[PDB]
């Protein structure tokens, strides 16, 4: 009866990447480079920020007093999200310690099927039987037990290793006739199988990746089915999963945000915190474009030399040198860009799931 098995400590013993970002002169691109009022205000702010995210995906506004290097130091500068060699077993202070303490199952489907036929073979009692169970049980949970003839008391069995936390991925479909937003960091009560757990799930798109790297969605996509990544006890039956929030304001104490099914119990799924820097190209020549309002120090431009530029018209490019001392810099682009286009910079960060707790009442 432990969520974190002692065997999880001896499984993930080989620390591969222990990279220190403090001893870096350039960005990490060495692979390819050189009470009701508070709730109302919070709901309004979340809706406005979701609308801003829909209009502008991941843009960050930089300040003249803001230093880009110190606040953007841990980010990376990879050119392609689905081709780069991301690693899952990196050591990071932002990672939870219980990432060390997880059960790492290799293949979900084969292990799940093996456990299902094991439960076929090792069933001591056959279905449909009048059976007496003596169960170990604490004293305090006795004093909220009611009589079974007035309220249903059902007993549900658990498979092998279902009590143990692991990184799990859920299907997430937006339930109809709620236009209300939901971020990827708020707690949400999730009922799967029979068990209810409070889960703060990371939202991602279910597009397949060769390196199993997926974009972290800040909010739920209102149109397409997303994938919710979290740390939770596993289910080996692929049970449908339901998602809600308890608020006693309604007659029902349920606001039902979504529905779905248990997709996978896989630890290889990481998420990418993407940070975008957007701005207007100042001046245009035949080959060299002088770009304005990226940074405010030329040494920031030097630190951002290797990471490529991209333009929302669909055109890649690179930097050449810092023109002025206010962030003006020369750059080379694939095509000819006007003043109505937006030049932008992409930075990427590792994102880890968070642990979950059971829900009662």
From Swiss-Prot:
It is found in: Cytoplasm; Nucleus, Nucleolus. It comes from the Eukaryota. Required for 40S ribosomal subunit synthesis. Required for normal export of the pre-40S particles from the nucleus to the cytoplasm. Its subcellular location and association with pre-40S subunitshifts from mixed cytoplasm/nucleus to all nuclear in RPS19 disruptions, suggesting it acts after the ribosomal protein. Interacts with RIO2. Present with 1390 molecules/cell in log phase SD medium. Belongs to the TRAFAC class translation factor GTPase superfamily. Bms1-like GTPase family. TSR1 subfamily. This is Ribosome biogenesis protein TSR1. It comes from Saccharomyces cerevisiae (strain ATCC 204508 / S288c). The chain holds residues 346 to 787 of 788 of the full protein.
